[PDB]
Amino acid sequence: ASMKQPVVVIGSGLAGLTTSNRLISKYRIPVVLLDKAASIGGNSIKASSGINGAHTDTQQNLKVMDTPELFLKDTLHSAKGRGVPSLMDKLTKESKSAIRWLQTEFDLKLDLLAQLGGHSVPRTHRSSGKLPPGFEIVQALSKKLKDISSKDSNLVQIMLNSEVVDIELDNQGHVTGVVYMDENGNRKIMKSHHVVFCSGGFGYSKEMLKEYSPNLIHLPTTNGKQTTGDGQKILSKLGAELIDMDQVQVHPTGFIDPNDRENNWKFLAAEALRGLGGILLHPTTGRRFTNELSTRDTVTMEIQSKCPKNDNRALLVMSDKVYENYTNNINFYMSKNLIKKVSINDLIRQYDLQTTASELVTELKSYSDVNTKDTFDRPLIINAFDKDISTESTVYVGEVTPVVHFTMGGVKINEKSQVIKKNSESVLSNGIFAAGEVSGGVHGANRLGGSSLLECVVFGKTAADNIAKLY
Ligand SMILES: Cc1cc2nc3c(=O)[nH]c(=O)nc-3n(C[C@H](O)[C@H](O)[C@H](O)COP(=O)(O)OP(=O)(O)OC[C@H]3O[C@@H](n4cnc5c(N)ncnc54)[C@H](O)[C@@H]3O)c2cc1C
C-alpha cells in the first residue's frame, strides 16, 4: 500500500503481534503498536501448553489423525450452546493455516504435541527445546517487528507504557484517532483510520468479575495485573455489542507457591502436565479423586467439591516418565519451588497425608495398569508410574488450586474481525477491529486448552487482511 496514517494495534500479546506482522510484512501498511505495560507480550508470553491446529504437518509426522471437523465437534461440545458457531467453524478450519504460518514465516518448529482436556486427539503444538510456546512465539514475532523497526522506523513503532483510553470518531462515524496516556501520564492522540483491539481479557479485574461472574471474586488468578478489561469497557461505551461476558474460565491447576501461599497471583501448572501423565491426589487422604483430563469447568468443579472447602487444593504428582517429556518446563517449576522431587515415604510425611506409603504404591500401580479400568475413567493414560515402584521411589509433586484464567466473553466480532454494533449486525465502524481474548463469541461456555493462542493467530491475520482491503 501507499503509506497513510498508521494502523493502531492495541496490545502486544499474540493477537497484536500477529496483526502487526501481517500488516507490515504482507502489505507494507504502517503500524503503531501501543501497550500500556512496561514490556511486550501480555498473558500470551506466559502460555505454557501450546497452540492448537487440526490436520497439521506435525500431526501427519506423529501419525495422529485429526480433522477440522473433529476439532469443531470438540469445540462445539466445549461451547455448550453459547458462542457464535460460524466463528468456531472459522477458528478450527483456519487452524491448519495458522500453524503453517508460524512454521514457515518464523521457523517455529511446533513439532511436539499434547492432548489437553476435552480434546479427542492430541492437537496442542509446542516446540522441542528449552522455550515454552508462549514465550517462543511472542519472542519470534516481536523480534521480527523490532528488526523492521530498527530498519524503517516509519513502518513500525512499538510504544510501551501507553494506555489507550478511547477512540475518536467523526460524526459519521469513521475512526479518526486513538486517545492514550503516555509514559508520563499525558494525554495524547494518535491520528488513524483503523484500530485493532488486541487488548486481552478481564480476569484480573475484581470489579469486572463482580459485574459479570461475582462468585469468582475471591479466587486467585494466573493473569497479569494489566488484564483489566479496558478494551471491552471502551468499546461498550462507544456502542459495541458485548457477548458471553459472564463466561469466565477457571483453570483447575494454578500453582501454590509454598513461600507465598495466599498470593492472589499464581504461576500456572500447565495442563500439559496432566495431558502428559500427571495425576491429582486429594490433599488430606493422598488418593486420586477425579478425571484429570476433562474440560476445565469440570475438573475445577470436582476439586471445589471433593477437596476440602477450606484448603481447596490438590497435589499434582508426576512420574519419572512425565519428567522425561516435559523436562525443561518441570526444571523451571522446580527452580521456583513449585514442584518438589520427593520419595513416596516423604510425600506422605511432608504433605501430612492419611494414606500409608505402601497404600499409595498399590494405588499408583493400579492407575498405571491399563488392563484394569480407571476408577475415574481417564481417556488417555501415558507416562505413568513404573511397574516396580516402591515406597522409596521418587515422584515430582506440586500443590495446585483453581484459578481465574480466561474470559471467553468480550466484544462481538464478525468473520472479518470487525466489531459489531450493539443491537445490530452492522459494524460499529469499518475502522474498528478486535482479535484475541478481548473478543467474545469464539469459545462459548468453556475454552479448550490451546485455542487461545490459536484465536490470536486466526483473527489477528484476518484483521490485517481485512484492513488491507480498506486501507
Ligand atoms: C499463565 C497462562 C498460560 C496460558 N497458556 C496458554 C496455552 O498454552 N495455549 C493457549 O492457547 N492459551 C494460553 N493462555 C491464554 C493465552 O496465553 C493468551 O493470554 C490469550 O490468547 C490472549 O492473548 P491476547 O493477545 O488476546 O491478549 P494478551 O496476551 O493478554 O495481550 C494483551 C495486551 O494488551 C495490553 N493492554 C491491555 N489494556 C490496554 C490498554 N488500555 N492500552 C494498551 N494496551 C493494553 C496488555 O498490557 C497486554 O500486553 C494462557 C494464559 C495465561 C495467563
Residue numbers in the entry: 31 to 501
What does the paper say about this structure?
Two soluble fumarate reductases, Frd1 and Osm1, which are essential for anaerobic growth, have been identified in Saccharomyces cerevisiae. Interestingly, a sequence comparison within the Fcc3 family has suggested that both Osm1 and Frd1 contain only a flavin domain and a clamp domain, and thus lack the cytochrome domain, which is critical for electron transfer.
Following an intensive effort to overcome these purification and crystallization issues, we finally solved the 1.8 Å crystal structure of Osm1. The Osm1 structure contained the FAD cofactor and the fumarate substrate in the active site. Fifteen amino acid residues, including A45, K66, N73, S74, S79, G80, V194, D260, E467, S482, and L483, from the flavin domain form hydrogen bonds of 3.5 Å or less with the FAD cofactor. Fumarate is located immediately next to the isoalloxazine ring of the FAD cofactor, having a direct interaction with the protein. S78, S79, H281, R326, H435, R477, and G480 from Osm1 are involved in the binding of fumarate in the active site through the formation of hydrogen bonds. Based on our analysis using SEC-MALS, we conclude that FAD- and substrate-bound Osm1 exists as a monomer in solution. Compared to the structures of other prokaryotic soluble fumarate reductases from the Fcc3 family, the most notable feature of the Osm1 structure was that it did not contain a heme domain, which is known to be critical for electron transfer.
